[PDB]
Write an enzyme that holds these catalytic residues in place. Structure first.
Site, PDB file in Angstrom:
ATOM      1  N   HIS A 104       0.834  -1.219   0.000  1.00 48.57           N
ATOM      2  CA  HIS A 104       0.000   0.000   0.000  1.00 48.57           C
ATOM      3  C   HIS A 104       0.861   1.258   0.000  1.00 48.57           C
ATOM      4  O   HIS A 104       0.314   2.339  -0.187  1.00 48.57           O
ATOM      5  CB  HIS A 104      -1.026  -0.032   1.102  1.00 48.57           C
ATOM      6  CG  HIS A 104      -0.531   0.318   2.439  1.00 48.57           C
ATOM      7  ND1 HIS A 104      -0.215  -0.663   3.371  1.00 48.57           N
ATOM      8  CD2 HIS A 104      -0.379   1.517   3.030  1.00 48.57           C
ATOM      9  CE1 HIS A 104       0.139  -0.060   4.480  1.00 48.57           C
ATOM     10  NE2 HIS A 104       0.058   1.289   4.310  1.00 48.57           N
ATOM     11  N   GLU A 132      18.724   7.192   8.813  1.00 47.70           N
ATOM     12  CA  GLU A 132      18.002   8.345   9.347  1.00 47.70           C
ATOM     13  C   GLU A 132      17.702   8.228  10.828  1.00 47.70           C
ATOM     14  O   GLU A 132      17.371   7.142  11.313  1.00 47.70           O
ATOM     15  CB  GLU A 132      16.674   8.485   8.647  1.00 47.70           C
ATOM     16  CG  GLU A 132      16.741   8.963   7.207  1.00 47.70           C
ATOM     17  CD  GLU A 132      17.034  10.446   7.111  1.00 47.70           C
ATOM     18  OE1 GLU A 132      17.496  11.072   8.088  1.00 47.70           O
ATOM     19  OE2 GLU A 132      16.797  11.008   6.030  1.00 47.70           O
ATOM     20  N   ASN A 190      16.616  11.920  12.615  1.00 45.27           N
ATOM     21  CA  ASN A 190      15.796  13.092  12.296  1.00 45.27           C
ATOM     22  C   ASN A 190      15.664  13.154  10.769  1.00 45.27           C
ATOM     23  O   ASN A 190      16.640  13.403  10.077  1.00 45.27           O
ATOM     24  CB  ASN A 190      16.401  14.358  12.872  1.00 45.27           C
ATOM     25  CG  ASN A 190      15.447  15.519  12.782  1.00 45.27           C
ATOM     26  OD1 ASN A 190      14.755  15.716  11.778  1.00 45.27           O
ATOM     27  ND2 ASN A 190      15.293  16.232  13.863  1.00 45.27           N
ATOM     28  N   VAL A 197      16.618  16.725   9.233  1.00 47.58           N
ATOM     29  CA  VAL A 197      17.939  17.337   9.401  1.00 47.58           C
ATOM     30  C   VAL A 197      18.965  16.349   8.876  1.00 47.58           C
ATOM     31  O   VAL A 197      18.881  15.186   9.163  1.00 47.58           O
ATOM     32  CB  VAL A 197      18.187  17.670  10.883  1.00 47.58           C
ATOM     33  CG1 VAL A 197      19.622  18.144  11.061  1.00 47.58           C
ATOM     34  CG2 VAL A 197      17.147  18.647  11.422  1.00 47.58           C
ATOM     35  N   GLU A 210      23.388   9.459   6.921  1.00 48.43           N
ATOM     36  CA  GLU A 210      22.371   9.105   5.908  1.00 48.43           C
ATOM     37  C   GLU A 210      22.995   8.569   4.624  1.00 48.43           C
ATOM     38  O   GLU A 210      24.071   8.990   4.227  1.00 48.43           O
ATOM     39  CB  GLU A 210      21.517  10.303   5.537  1.00 48.43           C
ATOM     40  CG  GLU A 210      20.728  10.855   6.699  1.00 48.43           C
ATOM     41  CD  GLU A 210      21.357  12.031   7.421  1.00 48.43           C
ATOM     42  OE1 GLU A 210      22.614  12.173   7.292  1.00 48.43           O
ATOM     43  OE2 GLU A 210      20.565  12.709   8.159  1.00 48.43           O
ATOM     44  N   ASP A 220       0.027  -7.636   1.652  1.00 45.73           N
ATOM     45  CA  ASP A 220       0.492  -6.235   1.707  1.00 45.73           C
ATOM     46  C   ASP A 220       2.021  -6.228   1.898  1.00 45.73           C
ATOM     47  O   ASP A 220       2.540  -5.936   2.987  1.00 45.73           O
ATOM     48  CB  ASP A 220      -0.296  -5.483   2.771  1.00 45.73           C
ATOM     49  CG  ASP A 220       0.014  -4.000   2.730  1.00 45.73           C
ATOM     50  OD1 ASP A 220       0.545  -3.519   1.687  1.00 45.73           O
ATOM     51  OD2 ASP A 220      -0.329  -3.307   3.713  1.00 45.73           O
ATOM     52  N   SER A 261       1.140   1.301  16.191  1.00 48.97           N
ATOM     53  CA  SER A 261       1.631   1.986  14.992  1.00 48.97           C
ATOM     54  C   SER A 261       0.484   2.853  14.458  1.00 48.97           C
ATOM     55  O   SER A 261      -0.669   2.645  14.859  1.00 48.97           O
ATOM     56  CB  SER A 261       2.136   1.007  13.973  1.00 48.97           C
ATOM     57  OG  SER A 261       1.130   0.071  13.700  1.00 48.97           O
ATOM     58  N   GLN A 291      -0.496   6.237  11.264  1.00 45.82           N
ATOM     59  CA  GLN A 291      -0.325   6.785   9.910  1.00 45.82           C
ATOM     60  C   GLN A 291       1.144   7.198   9.772  1.00 45.82           C
ATOM     61  O   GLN A 291       1.629   7.950  10.591  1.00 45.82           O
ATOM     62  CB  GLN A 291      -1.307   7.928   9.688  1.00 45.82           C
ATOM     63  CG  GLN A 291      -1.406   8.206   8.206  1.00 45.82           C
ATOM     64  CD  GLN A 291      -0.433   9.211   7.634  1.00 45.82           C
ATOM     65  OE1 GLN A 291       0.238   9.980   8.340  1.00 45.82           O
ATOM     66  NE2 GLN A 291      -0.380   9.248   6.311  1.00 45.82           N
ATOM     67  N   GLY A 292       1.795   6.769   8.703  1.00 42.67           N
ATOM     68  CA  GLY A 292       3.165   7.179   8.433  1.00 42.67           C
ATOM     69  C   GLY A 292       4.134   6.100   8.882  1.00 42.67           C
ATOM     70  O   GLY A 292       5.298   6.169   8.515  1.00 42.67           O
ATOM     71  N   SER A 325       3.341   2.986   8.185  1.00 42.45           N
ATOM     72  CA  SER A 325       3.093   2.026   7.091  1.00 42.45           C
ATOM     73  C   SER A 325       4.380   1.548   6.462  1.00 42.45           C
ATOM     74  O   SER A 325       5.228   2.370   6.135  1.00 42.45           O
ATOM     75  CB  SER A 325       2.260   2.651   5.998  1.00 42.45           C
ATOM     76  OG  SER A 325       0.972   2.810   6.422  1.00 42.45           O
ATOM     77  N   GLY A 326       4.488   0.236   6.288  1.00 41.59           N
ATOM     78  CA  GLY A 326       5.636  -0.352   5.581  1.00 41.59           C
ATOM     79  C   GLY A 326       6.801  -0.650   6.494  1.00 41.59           C
ATOM     80  O   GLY A 326       7.669  -1.356   6.019  1.00 41.59           O
TER      81      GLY A 326
HETATM   82  N1  LIG Z   1      -1.739   0.227  13.306  1.00 34.08           N
HETATM   83  C1  LIG Z   1      -1.652   1.364  12.383  1.00 34.08           C
HETATM   84  C2  LIG Z   1      -2.067   1.004  11.006  1.00 34.08           C
HETATM   85  C3  LIG Z   1      -2.052   2.089   9.991  1.00 34.08           C
HETATM   86  C4  LIG Z   1      -1.399   2.065   8.796  1.00 34.08           C
HETATM   87  N2  LIG Z   1      -1.767   3.141   8.035  1.00 34.08           N
HETATM   88  C5  LIG Z   1      -2.691   3.874   8.721  1.00 34.08           C
HETATM   89  C6  LIG Z   1      -3.352   5.039   8.344  1.00 34.08           C
HETATM   90  C7  LIG Z   1      -4.261   5.564   9.233  1.00 34.08           C
HETATM   91  C8  LIG Z   1      -4.537   4.936  10.450  1.00 34.08           C
HETATM   92  C9  LIG Z   1      -3.896   3.771  10.811  1.00 34.08           C
HETATM   93  C10 LIG Z   1      -2.925   3.234   9.952  1.00 34.08           C
HETATM   94 CA   LIG Z   2      18.452  12.942   8.776  1.00 29.82          CA
END
Ligand SMILES: NCCc1c[nH]c2ccccc12
Ligand SMILES: [Ca+2]
Length: 223
Positions: A40, A52, A54, A57, A62, A84, A172, A174-175, A177-178
């Site tokens: 995704h 990485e 920060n 910065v 890096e 996925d 976990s 948003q962000g 992911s992966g």
């Molecule tokens: N456990 C967090 C799963 C997750 C991945 N992408 C997201 C986007 C929005 C909310 C949760 C997520």
């Molecule tokens: Ca950095």
């Protein structure tokens, strides 16, 4: 990561940031030329950022390396998030060192109750928005298949597991992911989905990497 801790610079040396002008997903370095992430997270024009802490910065450790090829799992279903997983080949090999290091693929699937480390630069709040600049970590157990299926009726395939806390507060988000879920120094999971973040009875759902080792190895061998 909601309810985590600051990992510390380059303590998670296999963690990568996928950058398309901004951080949008995590990933794991599995050898000097390959990254695993979530399907995704697919998009064109990916730069892989290794070493990485920060992400805003330049700190000195890096390596920024363009993707040459992305391979989404052949059976990825964007509606169910089954399968996925995606592989990203780097244009050139990373220089491996104590701060940039590959993570082993599993020989075995991890059992429920195994403690794992999840990491990422995702949102740190369960309602509203605060994105950290430095890598966040969370220790969380793998939940039983039966707990996971009870939490997400009709949605959990044999290619998924739940990890986290049924009480909520730690997940976990948003962000993230992966990004990696690492148990006993092996990559067991990929941050895949959930119902929001850190909600009661709604743990995070992760791609079960141990089901994909033969696909990963055969794909790397031929690309
Ligand atoms: N456990 C967090 C799963 C997750 C991945 N992408 C997201 C986007 C929005 C909310 C949760 C997520
Ligand atoms: Ca950095």
């Amino acid at each position: 990561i909601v309810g985590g801790y600051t990992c510390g610079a380059n303590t998670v040396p296999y963690q990568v940031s996928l950058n398309s002008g901004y951080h949008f997903c995590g990933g794991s370095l599995i050898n000097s030329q390959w990254v695993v992430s979530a399907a995704h997270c697919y998009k064109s024009g990916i730069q892989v950022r290794l070493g990485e802490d920060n992400i805003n910065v330049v700190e000195g450790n890096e390596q920024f390396i363009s993707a040459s090829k992305s391979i989404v799992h052949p059976s990825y279903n964007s509606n169910t998030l089954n399968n996925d997983i995606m592989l990203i080949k780097l244009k050139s090999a990373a220089s491996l060192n104590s701060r940039v290091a590959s993570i082993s693929l599993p020989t075995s699937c991890a059992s429920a109750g195994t403690q794992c480390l999840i990491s990422g630069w995702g949102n740190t709040k369960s309602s509203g928005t605060s994105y950290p600049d430095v890598l966040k970590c969370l220790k969380a157990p793998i939940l039983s298949d039966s707990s996971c299926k009870s939490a997400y009726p009709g949605q959990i395939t044999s290619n998924m597991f739940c990890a986290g806390y049924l009480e909520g507060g730690k997940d976990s988000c948003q962000g993230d992911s992966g990004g990696p879920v690492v148990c006993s120094g092996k990559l067991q999971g990929i941050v895949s989905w959930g119902s929001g973040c850190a909600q009661k009875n709604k743990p995070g759902v992760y791609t079960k990497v141990c089901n994909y080792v033969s696909w990963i190895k055969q794909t790397i061998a031929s690309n």
